[PDB]
Amino acid sequence: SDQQLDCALDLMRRLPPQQIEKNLSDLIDLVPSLCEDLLSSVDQPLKIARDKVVGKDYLLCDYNRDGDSYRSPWSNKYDPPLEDGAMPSARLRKLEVEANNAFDQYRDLYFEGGVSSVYLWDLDHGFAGVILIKKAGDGSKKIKGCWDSIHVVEVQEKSSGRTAHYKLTSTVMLWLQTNKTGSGTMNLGGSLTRQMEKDETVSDSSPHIANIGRLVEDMENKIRSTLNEIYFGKTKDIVNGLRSIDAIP
């Protein structure tokens, strides 16, 4: 059933990524024993909830889910309200709020809009975080686009504490669609994932959020490039090898 999980994950590399939500819930119905793991391994399009209390938006993912509730990085409350959901230590909550600000500036500089959310949670020897970002297009040219970032980072502090080890697993979902007399309906969707593993110095001048940010930055810069190569280059070249306007020599 480590074997089952694999098959499950293999299947999800293959079913139209556009229907991940319905496919995942169907998949868990098929193999319930994989519920907890399927929910933390299968990426879904990010959703947005309003945080009434502060009237700000935030992003949803298994990592801020408990019961059927999601926690706001603003007010730190669960919604719907939940009796004793997982919470960061007050220490961690403090850093988390600081990672939220830090990455709101990141979001701004690189996306010039969109939403961001950062959720941290405690680990035995360090912590983990997930940095989430969503940016939609304008609908200029009747083409819809949405960009989804999911950066899940593990941080291993060593007793020295002069350094830490960082495991970043990064996903971006890119979603484009259009209906033109052309052409007709066209939906180009999916996601790329990549891992990094680095040791960085943790100091007052080089803090965790700086280290993590720099990783998340190298990574998106990379993936942005590959998304551009894959979507509008590779899948394009494939379409044009199925059929040719010009008669074949």
Partner: protein, 49 residues
Amino acid sequence: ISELPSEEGKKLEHFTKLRPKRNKKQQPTQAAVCRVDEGVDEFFTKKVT
């Protein structure tokens, strides 16, 4: 019925398996809670019929 031929060479690797884990207190009631996606239904239904 039995296992059919695969021409892929190697198994696919799932990176999200190895991510950090977050223990919850209350487990999900449903996989979803409370559009990417447009045109995709009719791709699997549209027919000259």
